[PDB]
């Protein structure tokens, strides 16, 4: 998720937020009308910091939402880990059965991504999601297809 971000769209969103706040450097300096560099620099830094914190928590929430689809289906159902480990401990062999089909993970991903408000809210989040999307679907198909035997 984080590798797909780009500098241009993030800068564009930051500039859009600045325009929405009406706190451009020209207006801010023309309003303050003082030479106290430390105070104005701290004000600008905190203005940026609030946006940085909000972006970080938004990305955290989206990342947890994406993670929530895969995790339950790992230890149980198709492609279970403890069954793999006890196969290794008993014999060292791991029989595996394969079939190419769509399952709960793929439908969960489809029902999750297609109607998430954060994509419409932020350009960077939407572009990162659409760029990294195919990998998520391929990983979901990989999770669904395999099944360690009983």
């Amino acid at each position: 998720l984080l590798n797909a971000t780009t500098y241009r769209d993030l800068e564009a969103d930051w500039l859009g937020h600045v325009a929405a706040r009406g706190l451009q450097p020209q207006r801010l300096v023309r309003r303050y009308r003082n030479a106290r560099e430390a105070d104005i620099a701290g004000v600008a830094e905190r203005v940026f910091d609030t946006w940085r914190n909000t972006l970080r928590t938004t990305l955290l929430d989206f990342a947890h939402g994406l993670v929530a689809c895969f995790a339950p289906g790992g230890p149980s159902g198709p492609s279970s880990f403890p069954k793999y480990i006890d196969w290794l401990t008993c014999l060292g062999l791991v029989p595996i059965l394969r079939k190419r089909q769509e399952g709960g993970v793929t439908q969960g991903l489809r029902a999750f991504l297609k109607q998430h408000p954060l994509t419409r809210q932020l350009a960077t989040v939407a572009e990162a999601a659409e760029r990294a999307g195919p990998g998520f679907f391929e990983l979901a198909l990989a999770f669904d297809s395999t099944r360690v035997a009983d």
Binding site: G16, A20, W51, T54, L55, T58
Partner: peptide, 7 residues
């Protein structure tokens, strides 16, 4: 004014 986490 808009913020990333807001509705």
């Amino acid at each position: 004014p808009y913020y990333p986490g807001e509705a």
